[PDB]
Amino acid sequence: EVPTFKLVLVGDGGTGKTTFVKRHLTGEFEKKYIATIGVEVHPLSFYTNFGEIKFDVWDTAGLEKFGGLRDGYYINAQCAIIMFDVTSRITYKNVPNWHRDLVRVCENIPIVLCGNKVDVKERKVKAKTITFHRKKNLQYYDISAKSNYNFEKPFLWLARKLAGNPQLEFV
Amino acid sequence: MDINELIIGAQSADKHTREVAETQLLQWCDSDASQVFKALANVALQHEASLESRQFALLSLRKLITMYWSPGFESYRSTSNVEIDVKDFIREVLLKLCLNDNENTKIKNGASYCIVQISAVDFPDQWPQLLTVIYDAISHQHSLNAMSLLNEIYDDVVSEEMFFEGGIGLATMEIVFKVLNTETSTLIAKIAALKLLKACLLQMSSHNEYDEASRKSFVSQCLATSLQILGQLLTLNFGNVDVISQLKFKSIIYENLVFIKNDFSRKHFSSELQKQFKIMAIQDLENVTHINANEPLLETVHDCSIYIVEFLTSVCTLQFSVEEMNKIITSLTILCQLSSETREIWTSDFNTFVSKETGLAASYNVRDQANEFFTSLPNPQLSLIFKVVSNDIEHSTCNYSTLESLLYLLQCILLNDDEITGENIDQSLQILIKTLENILVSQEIPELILARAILTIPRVLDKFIDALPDIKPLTSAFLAKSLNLALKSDKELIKSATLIAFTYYCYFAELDSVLGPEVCSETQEKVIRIINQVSSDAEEDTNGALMEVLSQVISYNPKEPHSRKEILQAEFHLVFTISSEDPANVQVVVQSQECLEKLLDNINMDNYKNYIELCLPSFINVLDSNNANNYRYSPLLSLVLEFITVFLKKKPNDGFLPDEINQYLFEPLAKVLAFSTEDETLQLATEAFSYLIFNTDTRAMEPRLMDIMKVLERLLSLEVSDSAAMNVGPLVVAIFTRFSKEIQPLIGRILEAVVVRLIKTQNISTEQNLLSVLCFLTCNDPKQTVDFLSSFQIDNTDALTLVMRKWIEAFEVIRGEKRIKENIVALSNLFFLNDKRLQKVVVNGVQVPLYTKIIKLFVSELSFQSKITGLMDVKESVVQLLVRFFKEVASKDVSGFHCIYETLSDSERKVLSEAL
Ligand SMILES: Nc1nc2c(ncn2[C@@H]2O[C@H](COP(=O)(O)OP(=O)(O)OP(=O)(O)O)[C@@H](O)[C@H]2O)c(=O)[nH]1
Ligand SMILES: [Mg+2]
């Protein structure tokens, strides 16, 4: 009876997808970059004024040497988040490939573009991040895992787009 | 062995089944790839199989091709088993799937991806059948599946060497032209052909500054043919029964034209064609605006209009006829009108309005493209079109359905850098300002029209500041009205519009000189009241705009003998509250830093006492409330520390900091340095504490020496990270510069702590910081430092030899002149001691005397220079240090230097002799 939505996390290594998912799952934040092999499936539960939304996040590996059968995971997905570190402009430059591979396997799904770790130093990609989403109708959010700047916004937007009720809000 | 079982298990969410399924798949395919590839192709071709399984089969075949196809891949795995008999089969399977119109889009996409992966190595020379089948299907059957396949092929794998020297370019261009020229081809086929044209243009544009006539002629001919064909297509017409497809057709046509115009040399795109396509694009705006009167339809209308306006922006350098200009305005008014969904969103949530108007919104409507269009216009066209938009505004004062869009176009025109001048604008601008005043004065006006009036008036005044003789009274009246209409209404959107208008007034007018001190004070009070009312519901980067407006307000803070204390207290209350709410927003943080700096530029030791009691108790409460969590990382804690450090750093130059601030800050700063562990928290707290020590009065700090020393010992003890320990330098510098007499009994503890942390730490930057600290210690008192280092032992071994080894190794690693100078002066001071107990230690990096290696390294530095610690800044170049060192040496302090020079290479001795 409880609705469930499959979420695939994509983005290069070092963009803090695992820290973001772990923060949502437990509230702890782990400081040491450990590589991810394959994918980890984590059930996230968000309470709302209109019942429960329960995403099943697929934390896909961001390293090509570890991305074994990575495209095999996007099948029958219902939403996706493209993560990139604003500290590494190459990751933003590689974001279009992530969007291409996402829309190939599951087209027209709601996809959120998330610039992780705005807190580190100063933005190295500045406002260029607006250029990609403005055409493909993604929504860009500055988020972080060291500080909870916007950590709930991507899931809130995905819940609004999937449940069809823009007035839904997390509590 | 059952491929279906593997492809079912691999999709399972549970870790165990997925990993074992993938391991079995890889082991099977490494054992015999020919069977696995054939099975995957079969289950991809079996229409009876579930779509998820077919798509997983194709996406797994894509990966297996990357590993076992053939050498030349950067990840090709040895001992493949894919004989040509399997490749020929699966190529046929893929080129059957990728163009079977009955197949679902996902399977076609997977097949095209696999074909692209194969073509990354096998194309074109190994697989001409691919190109033969694509060209056959496109030219004879107009199969848009094959056109999409070719378009994706050009995206990933085709390169300019294949495009120009190979047959790809000419053949593709001929096929595309043949498809476009024939009227029989369906509109969707034309769209696919134009997408192929766009890909070919991108191929021609990626390389530039060509140097081969074989390419230039081909490019020029293809450009001429493509422009002729696009003109013919734009001259073609449709029955308007498939308007969404016509909108996509026009959208891709103008995308091609904007690409040609913006990314190719002007030579190939004649100005006559510019003038023709200008008229064509204007007629297409008219057509799209008529079509719009008929939700996905509106979206495609806006998408097509964006590209048409982009083309007009590129052409904009051309002259626009008055009737063409009027058509452009009449179309942009219909196109720039706010959708009912956006009107509802702005009415219900002013935060989206603030995000959009501040330019931080994650969107790009037709309105932004119109802004770009009017911004790019040249001065004559801008001056003509301003009259048109002003006349349309004047005639449409009662037409509230469109007036908002007219005000937006007027704003966009006034954003243009060029100064609008013309024959009779003076009459026009008077009518315009009277209309805006009537809009402000009127009642029952829709809130969005009023909000557009409020933001347009500052642009009107700014653009025509050189033409209005009554600019001061008009600015005063309009500002007063904008503030009154925000105070006297409950629509927070209007309040946000008013504060944005206020920051636009601040960016052009010196309000503090035109309004007068009393009017300026009253406007500051009104704006802070508005900000206070708005802050109760701020979100989504509304706080950043509030902070910017507050910065502009405090930038007009009156002189100290006249400033109102209550206004300043409210200003600080706002800059604190708005930044404490949503503290993680980096923009809010930096703007609050700038606001505090602006609020503390006008301080003195008299009023600084009043500033202490206002500011400090707010920070002390947060420091106390963070004590329970052991001062762990938190955005609010870092924020209050970054405010404390700014308040300290903005010291009154008249003299030392008052004892009051020291008595306030010492206890919580000591506690956070003694208990915290987060790197950022320790760094900020050390930055504050060191400055407090450096600028505290000597007689006030003397009783607290033991506490300071204990804090330093903890801050460099092992239970804190080395990166946080990096900041130890400034604290020791402040201690020595402050306690210049009391440090004598306890200096041994400092040396012990520095040397122990130096020998423990691995981190390079931490090693450098401890080396700087030890350098400062040695330069202050070389005798005590050497006595302690030689006498004290760690792990039953004297510290001296280990620290010499690490010091010389790090100096050999150290870079940057600033750090080199400190080591230069330290080693020279050690040399000038002339005590045998140092120089008799043997060191190697051949074993040589310690002083000998010191002078050898100094020589090596002099050879290098021949061509940020700042703890010993003297602002003197390394060259004069070197020459004074060698001249003191040549003054024969110790005779060993001559023996070493004769031992050293003749070239080095010659370099020394030529340097001095
Ligand atoms: N400063 C800062 N560091 C962060 C933030 N989020 C994560 N990190 C750190 O950056 C690294 C991110 O690690 P992961 O979450 O595994 O990164 P990833 O790209 O998802 O890694 P893979 O899953 O292996 O591809 C870790 O060292 C985190 O502690 C953040 O918001 N700010
Ligand atoms: Mg990871």
Swiss-Prot record, chain A:
<dbReference type="GO" id="GO:0016973">
    <property type="term" value="P:poly(A)+ mRNA export from nucleus"/>
</dbReference>
<feature type="binding site">
    <location>
        <begin position="12"/>
        <end position="19"/>
    </location>
    <ligand>
        <name>GTP</name>
    </ligand>
</feature>
<keyword id="KW-0597">Phosphoprotein</keyword>
<dbReference type="GO" id="GO:0005829">
    <property type="term" value="C:cytosol"/>
</dbReference>
<comment type="subunit">
    <text>Found in a nuclear export complex with RanGTP, exportin and pre-miRNA. Forms a complex with YRB1. Interacts with BUD5, CEX1, RRP12, SRM1, and DIS3/RRP44.</text>
</comment>
<dbReference type="GO" id="GO:0005525">
    <property type="term" value="F:GTP binding"/>
</dbReference>
<comment type="function">
    <text>GTP-binding protein involved in nucleocytoplasmic transport. Required for the import of protein into the nucleus and also for RNA export. Essential for cell viability. By analogy with Ras, Ran may be activated when GTP is exchanged for bound GDP by RCC1 and inactivated when GTP is hydrolyzed by Ran upon activation by RanGAP1.</text>
</comment>
<keyword id="KW-0007">Acetylation</keyword>
<keyword id="KW-0653">Protein transport</keyword>
<keyword id="KW-0342">GTP-binding</keyword>
<dbReference type="GO" id="GO:0006606">
    <property type="term" value="P:protein import into nucleus"/>
</dbReference>
<feature type="binding site">
    <location>
        <position position="62"/>
    </location>
    <ligand>
        <name>GTP</name>
    </ligand>
</feature>
<dbReference type="GO" id="GO:0005737">
    <property type="term" value="C:cytoplasm"/>
</dbReference>
<protein>
    <recommendedName>
        <fullName>GTP-binding nuclear protein GSP1/CNR1</fullName>
    </recommendedName>
</protein>
<feature type="binding site">
    <location>
        <begin position="116"/>
        <end position="119"/>
    </location>
    <ligand>
        <name>GTP</name>
    </ligand>
</feature>
<comment type="similarity">
    <text>Belongs to the small GTPase superfamily. Ran family.</text>
</comment>
<keyword id="KW-0539">Nucleus</keyword>
<dbReference type="GO" id="GO:0000467">
    <property type="term" value="P:exonucleolytic trimming to generate mature 3'-end of 5.8S rRNA from tricistronic rRNA transcript (SSU-rRNA, 5.8S rRNA, LSU-rRNA)"/>
</dbReference>
<dbReference type="GO" id="GO:0003924">
    <property type="term" value="F:GTPase activity"/>
</dbReference>
<dbReference type="GO" id="GO:1901987">
    <property type="term" value="P:regulation of cell cycle phase transition"/>
</dbReference>
<feature type="domain" description="Small GTPase Ran-type">
    <location>
        <begin position="1"/>
        <end position="165"/>
    </location>
</feature>
<keyword id="KW-0813">Transport</keyword>
From Swiss-Prot, chain B:
<dbReference type="InterPro" id="IPR001494">
    <property type="entry name" value="Importin-beta_N"/>
</dbReference>
<comment type="similarity">
    <text>Belongs to the importin beta family.</text>
</comment>
<dbReference type="GO" id="GO:0051028">
    <property type="term" value="P:mRNA transport"/>
</dbReference>
<keyword id="KW-0509">mRNA transport</keyword>
<dbReference type="GO" id="GO:0061608">
    <property type="term" value="F:nuclear import signal receptor activity"/>
</dbReference>
<feature type="modified residue" description="N-acetylmethionine">
    <location>
        <position position="1"/>
    </location>
</feature>
<keyword id="KW-0007">Acetylation</keyword>
<dbReference type="GO" id="GO:0005643">
    <property type="term" value="C:nuclear pore"/>
</dbReference>
<dbReference type="GO" id="GO:0005634">
    <property type="term" value="C:nucleus"/>
</dbReference>
<dbReference type="GO" id="GO:0005635">
    <property type="term" value="C:nuclear envelope"/>
</dbReference>
<dbReference type="Pfam" id="PF03810">
    <property type="entry name" value="IBN_N"/>
</dbReference>
<dbReference type="InterPro" id="IPR056840">
    <property type="entry name" value="HEAT_IPO9_central"/>
</dbReference>
<keyword id="KW-0653">Protein transport</keyword>
<dbReference type="GO" id="GO:0006607">
    <property type="term" value="P:NLS-bearing protein import into nucleus"/>
</dbReference>
<protein>
    <recommendedName>
        <fullName>Importin subunit beta-5</fullName>
    </recommendedName>
</protein>
<keyword id="KW-0539">Nucleus</keyword>
<feature type="domain" description="Importin N-terminal">
    <location>
        <begin position="21"/>
        <end position="100"/>
    </location>
</feature>
<dbReference type="GO" id="GO:0031267">
    <property type="term" value="F:small GTPase binding"/>
</dbReference>
<keyword id="KW-0813">Transport</keyword>
<dbReference type="GO" id="GO:0005829">
    <property type="term" value="C:cytosol"/>
</dbReference>
<keyword id="KW-0963">Cytoplasm</keyword>
<dbReference type="GO" id="GO:0005737">
    <property type="term" value="C:cytoplasm"/>
</dbReference>
